[PDB]
Amino acid sequence: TVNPITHYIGSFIDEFALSGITDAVVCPGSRSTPLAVLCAAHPDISVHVQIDERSAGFFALGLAKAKQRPVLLICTSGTAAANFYPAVVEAHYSRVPIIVLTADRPHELREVGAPQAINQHFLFGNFVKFFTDSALPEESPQMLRYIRTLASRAAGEAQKRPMGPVHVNVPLREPLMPDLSDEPFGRMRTGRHVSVKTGTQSVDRESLSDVAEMLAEAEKGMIVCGELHSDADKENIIALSKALQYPILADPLSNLRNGVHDKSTVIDAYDSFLKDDELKRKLRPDVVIRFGPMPVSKPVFLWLKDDPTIQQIVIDEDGGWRDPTQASAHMIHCNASVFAEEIMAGLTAATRSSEWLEKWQFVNGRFREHLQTISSEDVSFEGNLYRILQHLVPENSSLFVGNSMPIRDVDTFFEKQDRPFRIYSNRGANGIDGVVSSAMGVCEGTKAPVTLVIGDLSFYHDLNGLLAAKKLGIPLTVILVNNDGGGIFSFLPQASEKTHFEDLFGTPTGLDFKHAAALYGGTYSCPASWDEFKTAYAPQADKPGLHLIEIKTDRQSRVQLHRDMLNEAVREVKKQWEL
Amino acid sequence: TVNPITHYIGSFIDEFALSGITDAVVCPGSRSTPLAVLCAAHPDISVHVQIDERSAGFFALGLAKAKQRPVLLICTSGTAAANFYPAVVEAHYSRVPIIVLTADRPHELREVGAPQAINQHFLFGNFVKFFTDSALPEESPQMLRYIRTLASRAAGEAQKRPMGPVHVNVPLREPLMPDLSDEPFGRMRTGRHVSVKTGTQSVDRESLSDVAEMLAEAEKGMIVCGELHSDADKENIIALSKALQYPILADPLSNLRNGVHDKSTVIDAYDSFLKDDELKRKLRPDVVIRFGPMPVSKPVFLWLKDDPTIQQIVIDEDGGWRDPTQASAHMIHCNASVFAEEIMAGLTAATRSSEWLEKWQFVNGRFREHLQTISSEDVSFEGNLYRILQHLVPENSSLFVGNSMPIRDVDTFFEKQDRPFRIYSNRGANGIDGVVSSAMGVCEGTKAPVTLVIGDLSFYHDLNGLLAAKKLGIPLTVILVNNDGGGIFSFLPQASEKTHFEDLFGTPTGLDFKHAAALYGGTYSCPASWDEFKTAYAPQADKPGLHLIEIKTDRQSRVQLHRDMLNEAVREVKKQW
Amino acid sequence: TVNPITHYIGSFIDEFALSGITDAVVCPGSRSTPLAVLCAAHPDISVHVQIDERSAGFFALGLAKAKQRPVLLICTSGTAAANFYPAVVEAHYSRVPIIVLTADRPHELREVGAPQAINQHFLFGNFVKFFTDSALPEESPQMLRYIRTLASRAAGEAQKRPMGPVHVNVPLREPLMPDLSDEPFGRMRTGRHVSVKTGTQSVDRESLSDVAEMLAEAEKGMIVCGELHSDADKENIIALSKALQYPILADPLSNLRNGVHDKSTVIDAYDSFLKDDELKRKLRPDVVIRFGPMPVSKPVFLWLKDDPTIQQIVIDEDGGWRDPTQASAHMIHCNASVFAEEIMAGLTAATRSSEWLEKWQFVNGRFREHLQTISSEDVSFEGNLYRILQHLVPENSSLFVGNSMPIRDVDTFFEKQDRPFRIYSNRGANGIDGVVSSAMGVCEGTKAPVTLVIGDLSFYHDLNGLLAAKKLGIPLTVILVNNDGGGIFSFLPQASEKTHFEDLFGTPTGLDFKHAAALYGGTYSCPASWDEFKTAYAPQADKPGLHLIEIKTDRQSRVQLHRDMLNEAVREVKKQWEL
Ligand SMILES: Cc1ncc(C[n+]2csc(CCOP(=O)(O)OP(=O)(O)O)c2C)c(N)n1
Ligand SMILES: Cc1ncc(C[n+]2csc(CCOP(=O)(O)OP(=O)(O)O)c2C)c(N)n1
Ligand SMILES: Cc1ncc(C[n+]2csc(CCOP(=O)(O)OP(=O)(O)O)c2C)c(N)n1
Ligand SMILES: [Mn+2]
Ligand SMILES: [Mn+2]
Ligand SMILES: [Mn+2]
Ligand code: NA
Ligand code: NA
Ligand code: NA
Secondary structure, three states, X not given: OOOHHHHHHHHHHHHHHHOOOOEEEEOOOOOOHHHHHHHHHOOOOEEEEOOOHHHHHHHHHHHHHHHOOOEEEEEOOXXXXXOOHHHHHHXXXXXXXXXXXXXXXXXXXXXXXXXXXXXXXXXXXXXXXXXXXXXXXXXXXXXXXXXXXXXXXXXXXXXXXOOOEEEEEEEOOOOOOOOOOOOOOOOOXXXXXXXXXXXXXXXXXXXXXXXXXXXXXXXXXXXXXXXXXXXXXXXXXXXXXXXXXXXXXXXXXXXXXXXXXXXXXXXXXXXXXXXXXXXXXXXXXXXXXXXXXXXXXXXXXHHHHHOOOOEEEEEOOOOOOOOOOOOOOEEEOOOHHHHHHHHHHHOOOOOOOOHHHHHHHHHHHHHHHHHHOOOOOOOOOHHHHHHHHOOOOOOOOEEEEOOOHHHHHHHHHOOOEOOOOEEEOOOOOOOOOOHHHHHHHHHHXXXXXXXXXXXXXXHHHOHHHHHHHHHOOOOEEEEEEEOOOOXXXXXXXXXXXXXXXXXXXXXXOOOOOHHHHHHOOXXXXXXXXXXXXXHHOOOOOOOXXXXXXXXXXXXXXXXXXXXXXXXHHHHHHHHHHHO | OOOHHHHHHHHHHHHHHHHOOXXXXXXXXXXXXXXXXXXXXXXXXXXXXXXOHXXXXXHHHHHHHHHOOOEEEEEOOOHHHHOOHHHHHHHHHHOOOEEEEEEEOOHHHOOOOOOOOOOOOOOOHHHOOOEEEOOOOOOOHHHHHHHHHHHHHHHHHHHOOOOOEEEEEEEOOOOOOOOOOOOOOOOOOOOOOOOOOOOOOOOOOHHHHHHHHHHHOOOOEEEEEXXXXXXXXXXXXXXXXXXXXXXXXXXXXXXXOEOOOXXXXXXXXXXXXXXXXXXXXXXXXXXXXXXOOOOOOHHHHHHHHHXXXXXXXXXXXXXXXXXXXXXXXXXXXXXXXXXXXXXXXXXXXXXXXXXXXXXXXXXXXHHHHHHHOOOOOOOOOHHHHHHHHOOOOOOOOEEEEOOOHHHHHHHHHOOOEOOOOEEEOOOOOOOOOOHHHHHHHHHHHHOOXXXXXXXXXXXXXXXXXXXXXXXXXXXXXXXXXXXXXXHHHHHOHHHHOHHHHHHHHHOOOOOOOHHHHHHOOOEEEOOOOHHHHHHHOOOOOOOOOEEEEEEEOOHHHHHHHHHHHHHHHHHHHHHHO | OOOHHHHHHHHHHHHHHHHOOOEEEEOOOOOOHHHHHHHHHOOOOEEEEOOOHHHHHHHHHHHHHHHOOOEEEEEOOOHHHHOOHHHHXXXXXXXXXXEEEEEEOOHHHXXXXXXOOOOOOOOOHHHOOOEEEOOOOOOOXXXXXXXXXXXXXXXXXXXXXXXXXXXXXXXXXXXXXXXOOOOXXXXXXXXXXXXXXXXXXXXXXXXXXXXXXXXXXOOOEEEEEOOOOOHHHHHHHHHHHHHHOOOEEEOHHHOOOEOOOOOOOEEOOHHHHOOOHHXXXXXXXXXXXXXXXXXXXXXXXXXXXXXXXXXXXXXXXXXXXXXXXXXXXXXXXXXXXXXXXXXXXXXXXXXXXXXXXXXXXXXXXXXXXXXXXXXXXOOOOHHHHHHHHOOOOOOOOEEEEOOOHHHHHHHHHOOOEOOOOEEEOOOOOOOOOOHHHHHXXXXXXXXXXXXXXXXXXXXXXXXXXXXXXXXXXXXXXXXEEEOOOOHHHHHOHHHOOHHHHHHHHHOOOOOOOHHHHHHOOOEEEOOOOHHHHXXXXXXXXXXXXXXXXXXXXXXHHHHHHHHHHHHHHHHHHHHHHHX
């Protein structure tokens, strides 16, 4: 008897391959037997095996995040699928295309207390934009058309704007092993069963009129740019700002701070200097153009929120609604490059004055220049790491930035610079979970060196993710910023309420992470100065190697030091202004 | 200028305490500040701080599994809550009561791209029997009544049969820090705002007629008994099987293989000998009574499923539907003790024939007796562990058993004995996830020694759960069964196909676990013999102390040796006959 | 002191008006007080009061279908909202924008057995693309920004492609009456709080290459056009068929059969003649281009489904996936006009051969000519009503076509003609529910005459929808095709199993509908010939006026007369073809 799984799943897997899927992250199980095996057999899909399904999730995340096209993510029936939940959520908010396949029992064994079986229908709720429970396998030509169409449709839904996770629950009946000598991947058509052509979203010159006029009329504007992934969008946003002569508050994930592009318009110190009331009044713009999601900067958020008379224009091609201020005045569902090209074409020919832009460049330059006069030697002040690391991230490598303080410190401390490198971070939901695995995935995805900057609780959180270093031979340099607990919470007003603060917020572990390096076969460094940090820090991607570089820092004293440093620089700016 | 959070959340947490909540498992975060601070400040609730929310969830699972009453599980907004999903699923199917509180942002900050904010409504779907999005804090008498009522209700729901997880999403608005010096816990009533009294379920004399008739008139019955947690139900199920003279196929989770109760009726080798067609025909029963969920034994499942003419009577007080054979003939939603007694009170004085019982005892005695003559010295054969460890587990302690082969090996090799101890396992959904933390929770829950028997892939899966040892000073003995990979898959007929087997199923980590022991401050042992295993093995609960005992075994040769051993004790049974 | 509801809900309703809402369909209730009163008081919103929520829902459906922009749909707490489900489902599949607002009890009165309170959270599941449970009313400036933003957002989501229903559940605390003397609609800005600019989707020249290339090369192509709304799209689809010389199988809902456009390419008898295997064999195309949802024609479906080697190109601007054949070869997520212009731009100037097209025009013309010769005098044969009615539908009016046989008969017997009028049908889910109220709403919507052709079970189903005639003074001409039961089931192979058929499928009512006309103050006709019909039939929209025109037909003999009549025409075609 032919087993219907051979050609049904064969066709399913083959069609994903035809769709451009080149990678599959697979977690072991018996029930998922045919999905796994057939991904392995298929010559166009590379299989990455991961034991911990939570890490597996964030690994696929990182992979897909790197290439901006989907990867398969496969597990067996039971709590295995439930473990994907954190990564699916992050993928949903970050708009990362993932195709989740979960094996399931057939109907006669569901909802009746069979071993390892759970309700997998709509498991991920609305975090996935497409869900289906595939038909029990069948061999008819009509059902093979159905299964290939399902695969294409799933891949198509993942890549369709609001890119995100999709979910196919795959019930499978016993005899699970596909017959690999019976052309399981056999096709009827020459190429793709169905090719899916998704498109760009545009808003025309005319409906854009209100916005063009307010931009034509406002000398005082600023562009706020969060996470960016498109080169074209970056070139065009930069061009747009020169045409308007508006400064760009550039979030680190925007990657406008680091590159050979023109940066005269780029402002990198705003998170610090905008905490001052007086500089805010001075730099208050009449109009704001936002690109991408909200920047990391809390002071930019508070600024737009607490001053709603500032007219915000929000550009989001995907047509979502990302504006926690409730104060934005225009929500524009337009490709960033189309939007910028249209505005530029509508402006008059006269080069605008750069006076307004100069105020910003003045405040920014004077801020950074004063910071330079303040010592960065002390490795135990957490801030200094970033003041040093910015200059050392090798050209064309990736920097994966942990949540909690590291993404805030990168924002605070990274100045604009001429060397290309990519900053990545899990900013859809800001989890400290699966960060190691995301960085691992990014590495698989880019095939270039990756540095991961990460706090100790986060590191601990995804210790399991280090398995990929050896098991998959994935090179990674981890900069572990270890202040033994949750350093971010020291910034809360409630940090003085000391009877509970340490138990419930500081939460130290006391862990010696050199044992984690050994566990996962990585090398270990614990530099006591930047000279020896520089000697230790050498990311690479030519061969396997896990390098843990641990920096011990003092969370109990960092807040006052941090604030004195910045306040002192802000104070200097105000003095220069008065000259 | 009062913060409404002070008394609103104060009243919320205080009421949980009034309901009998004594433990809160708490994961750090900003938005959950009042939840965590108030649990900490309240004199009746012990706080257990966990960093890894996935671990935290299984830690709470184990705590509530040990006590059969709800604990609080708390986290802040975002992917934190999503990390509770695996434990919530297991609690759902194991029927473990847990009250999940997830901090959220307020409305003006939801669904709008705010930092760390996710859609938390109905987060766990129907794995939870009760969900609500609680009101934004307000301090009026009416809303304080509402909030106290919600806590009790949440508590009551988790304990209402099918016990299980419940979820309250708690949106909170800045000023987050409650004012501790302003009587946050103040009430209007002397005790509980609302006391919830749930009850036992009963089916009456009449409705049990057809069933009590068939049992009376059937000589050839067996009782299948999986996981049980009731002392009364255990006694009565035994009483019952004496009155009828039916054998009891005791799943390890029934715990009927290890206690002071009478065990003449208890059968423990069935999973092994029922693999033979001939012994099955000899011992084919007319009627089967089931208590608890499905036993671990696949052969018992396949028996009832492939011989549908065997009449099954399934007893389930919770009214669930656990029977993947699709062939049971009576589903009875009645308390196990009430059912047993009603069946017994309707039996005549006609002292029952025990030949049928004796056929079972014969087969069990002969199986065990022959196996005993087989050498157990080789530490590298996985089965031997359980053959030795059975006699070593301290009295009044707990053995937590990992999924995959360990629960199966416990089934195969644990014989009935008089030494009392409890066996636990995550058999709701058989995950290899969070097993270490569940054992950790059981230890906290019982304040008695705990031994965890776990395979290597599962141990790696919840390495992070070991943090509880130093951070919470919970003692634990871990017997790490390391065969470097997924040993269970070797039993599959598809293990023969070699090109992919190892990659996709074997999946070795090659991890050296001594480094893990160092990481979490545990003492390490790697005994080459049962003598040094004995010296190393010393579970205790008086002080902190993590002990990792690694047994290296060979999965490549394990199956063939396992089958020989067993097929030989079966052959020997068929001859003694 | 002040009631929060006054400015909270006031700001909510005012912002909907600022969004473009001009109509609110409202159902009475106590808990929905502020919603209904404030809509009533607002100068830009017309309130339409419907008692039966199910009718209300379909009425809102027709109103929004007519104008292609959203309306408010409002009811109190409880089963009232559950009665919107059928309309919401139809709006979802038909892609009709509706903003559904449901009043609710406050938290302290929910899930605790309070009178009339049900769980309204996610009431409509995923039939709505946006749902929220709004905050309890508050008066703070931040919450008035939140609620105005919510109104904009709800409106924006209903109009955002795949247009459809959205749901806001509105919990309200008692004292419910807003203070109308305290400027409930007061703004913080001049004009819209946020303006939402949706755009259009385009695929660029380059990713259209393969499809353009195959279309330039395929002589034998066909365009299949289902429900259309855009005038630009019609013009461009027609232009494209001439550039390519492809016939357009024009579904009645394309409205390509009844307008001033060039119809030289329009094929109208395909549903009939494509039932024949030999004509199918002769007219088989290599490529198919689909616009709009699937047509009504079952024969076209089965054709495309059973010959998967016919290469289909489906254009769907909204990004959905409408193809029940599982056989399509390309899904293009692109504006139809844009797609059309791109293909035309890539075509050479060379004369396109018209022989292929002439085969189709020949078949169609011969079919229709032979049908001309078959008499239509018999008012008891249902087909005839449509052969007569097509020339009688007043120019610039609407024909709303009931589901079941009417839509099929319209497809069968409406030929192309130069007279303009619009045909509407609820083809989203094909329900026989709410058709009257839909019609009523199309009349409110177009401010022009509406004719409704509907079968008797359907007409019975929404008898309540006729209240809108008296109560709301809406004129409607109802052509009631009464065959006493489910006429359509006679085409089933199972109409022979007489032992259960009449009981389960025929389902006669015996109802004398003149009582219904009387109940609702309508005038009644029962024409015995087409002459009496031509005399009674006079759709208008200047005054109130409900006209019920009943046609009694015989479903027992219909099928054979129908099939004989069409097969006769088909056979004439083949004869003619041989000459
Ligand atoms: C999965 C998850 N759980 C909890 C949180 C709440 N949270 C935000 S920051 C933080 C502490 C992070 O500590 P660490 O990684 O050491 O960085 P640090 O604060 O020391 O810079 C926590 C627990 C979260 N963001 N994600
Ligand atoms: C969370 C989860 N992922 C995957 C599975 C599928 N599964 C069942 S047993 C097993 C292998 C476990 O290996 P180990 O703990 O070493 O036990 P062994 O098979 O060697 O006895 C797997 C992957 C599961 N049950 N749960
Ligand atoms: C709400 C609903 N219920 C049932 C159906 C199934 N259905 C399709 S046609 C039909 C019969 C309708 O009869 P009628 O309106 O008299 O038109 P006729 O069939 O006589 O052409 C039914 C019940 C449906 N489409 N919608
Ligand atoms: Mn830290
Ligand atoms: Mn193992
Ligand atoms: Mn009818
Ligand atoms: Na492969
Ligand atoms: Na406490
Ligand atoms: Na009005």
